[PDB]
Amino acid sequence: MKAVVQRVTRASVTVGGEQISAIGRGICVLLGISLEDTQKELEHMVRKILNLRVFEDESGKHWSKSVMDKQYEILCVSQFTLQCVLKGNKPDFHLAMPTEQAEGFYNSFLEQLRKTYRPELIKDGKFGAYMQVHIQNDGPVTIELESPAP
């Protein structure tokens, strides 16, 4: 499992100009699920996202508070392209989990996130859809996470 995490002042997902979801301050997670991914990686990745210290405290010290410390929001979007192998210049996605299983895995992942944090502060894209993910990256701050190695 891989994730790209971007700290946002706001973020939203549109499908065909229709706004699907939107968050204010918090974190946008692009989530790459691999073929070899299991419940262990699912649970480990949730813990890492929720505990990632990307926010300031009241004094303004950097890297001192997680999304949960701040009671901020999380926008998760499924992103199989992160499971890319770069032989030549064309991407190959053989390491990504196929969409039939991946949708179930993704849904279970979002559900662990909601039960570990607060459901109302967790927003999603639309798994199969051609989306525009509007990301107002605050800083910018961008962190790569991986769980096969936690």
Binding residues for Mg(2+), by number, are 4, 6, 28
Taking CB under 8 A as the rule, does residue 110 contact its own copies? no
Q: What is the 3-state secondary structure (H, E, C) of 14-78?
A: EECCEEEEEECCEEEEEEECECCCCHHHHHHHHHHHHHCEEECCCCCCCCCEEHHHHCCEEEEEE
Identify the residue among 28, 45, 76, 102 touching Mg ion (CB under 5 A): 28
Q: Confirm if 78 and 33 have CB atoms less than 8 A apart.
A: yes
Distance in Å, CB of 133 to its own copies, minimum: 4
Smaller CB distance to its own copies: residue 52 or 97? Answer: 52
Residues that bind its own copies (CB under 8 A): 2, 4, 6, 9, 30, 48, 51-54, 63-64, 66, 77, 79, 81-82, 84-86, 88-91, 125, 130-145
